[PDB]
Design a protein around this ligand. Structure first.
Ligand SMILES: O=P(O)(O)O[C@H]1[C@H](O)[C@@H](OP(=O)(O)O)[C@@H](OP(=O)(O)O)[C@@H](OP(=O)(O)O)[C@H]1O
Length: 138
């Protein structure tokens, strides 16, 4: 809602990365979408136009399971996004794009696990940790 508390989305976190799923039926996978962490639920827009700008997916997924495995040797970042649900498990994995990428979602994703987003000072240590390897060697 929007009356006494929960005025707006206190925790703002958003970025654009690639996503690709095996799809249960067929679909097409491979899509550029910019999701954002609102008050306590997520939102998804593939085109601010959508004729009305209304997002296609909007719900509180949370429980995102993150697996950190990024070898800087070839500057290869590989984070798999898994989420348990009633149907079973939504296997999802986003593609890499630049160190600035892992810092935004890899951290938020982790936080998003405890339910909150990068609104915790702890996340600082998560992003401050990755960029630390760059200082050591590109
Ligand atoms: O537009 P089409 O070709 O139908 O495909 C989309 C994409 O698969 C979306 O992927 P992403 O999750 O990266 O946004 C999402 O898949 P999922 O269904 O697995 O969530 C949409 O869910 P639906 O719009 O609810 O069908 C699906 O419709």
């Amino acid at each position: 809602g929007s009356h006494m508390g929960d005025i707006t989305s206190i925790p703002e976190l958003a970025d654009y990365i690639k996503v690709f799923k095996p799809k249960k039926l067929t679909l097409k996978g491979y899509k550029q979408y910019w999701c954002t962490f609102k008050d306590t639920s997520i939102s998804c827009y593939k085109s601010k136009e959508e004729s009305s700008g209304t997002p296609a997916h909007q719900m509180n997924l949370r429980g995102c399971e993150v697996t950190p495995d990024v070898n800087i040797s070839g500057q290869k970042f590989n984070i798999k996004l898994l989420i348990p649900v009633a149907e079973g498990m939504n296997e999802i994995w986003l593609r890499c794009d630049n160190e600035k990428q892992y810092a935004h979602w890899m951290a938020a994703c982790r936080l998003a696990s405890k339910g909150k987003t990068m609104a915790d000072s702890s996340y600082n240590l998560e992003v401050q940790n990755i960029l630390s390897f760059l200082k050591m060697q590109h």
